[PDB]
A paper describes a structure:
We reasoned that to enable systematic design of binders to convex protein target sites it would be necessary to generate scaffold sets with overall concave shapes. We focused on 5 helix bundle scaffolds with three helices forming the concave interface and two helices providing structural support. The selected 7476 scaffolds, which we refer to as 5HCS (5 helix concave scaffolds) throughout the remainder of the text, have a wide range of curvatures. Our method for computationally designing small but concave proteins to bind to convex protein target sites expands the space of the protein surfaces that can be targeted by de novo protein design.
Because of the therapeutic importance of the target, and receptor extracellular Ig domains more generally, we next sought to evaluate the generality of our approach by designing 5HCS based binders to [name]-4. [name]-4 plays an important role in peripheral tolerance and the prevention of autoimmune disease by inhibition of T cell activation. Deep sequencing of a site saturation mutagenesis library of the most enriched binder, 5HCS_CTLA4_0, showed that the designed core and interfacial residues of the binder were highly conserved, suggesting the design folds and binds target as in the computational model. We determined co-crystal structures of 5HCS_CTLA4_1 with [name]-4 and unbound crystal structures of 5HCS_CTLA4_2. The unbound crystal structure of 5HCS_CTLA4_2 aligns with the structure of binder in 5HCS_CTLA4_1 bound structure well with a rmsd. of 0.416 Å. The circular dichroism spectra indicates a helical structure with peaks at 208 nm and 222 nm consistent with the design model and was unchanged by heating to 95 °C, indicating high thermal stability.
Author numbering: 1 to 103
The structure:
């Protein structure tokens, strides 16, 4: 399945950036993930958006990319709205935990 495979690759890329403190790789990877998150939200792929935004938050905080942090605040706003409208209690708590880690 092309979408799951690609999300899994994006998660791996960001995970390796986080473990290696790879500041050089991070800016390109974070901008890409920001665009993927917006698509995922548009197509109501909320499970995958939650797993990707969590590792995106970890990386953005670790490398202190203040622009991406600001963008992630907005995407978290939208994601929380969308998980609440779909009444998904497990996703709600996951998004809250990410919000608490970004803050």
């Amino acid at each position: 399945n092309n979408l799951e495979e690609e999300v899994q690759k994006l998660l791996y890329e960001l995970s390796e950036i986080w473990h290696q403190h790879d500041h050089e790789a991070s800016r390109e990877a974070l901008h890409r993930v920001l665009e993927v998150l917006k698509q995922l939200l548009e197509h109501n792929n909320l499970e995958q958006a939650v797993e990707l935004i969590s590792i995106a938050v970890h990386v953005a905080v670790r490398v202190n990319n203040e622009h991406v942090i600001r963008e992630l605040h907005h995407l978290l706003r939208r994601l929380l709205k969308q998980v609440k409208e779909h009444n998904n209690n497990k996703l709600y708590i996951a998004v809250m935990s990410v919000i608490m880690q970004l803050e």
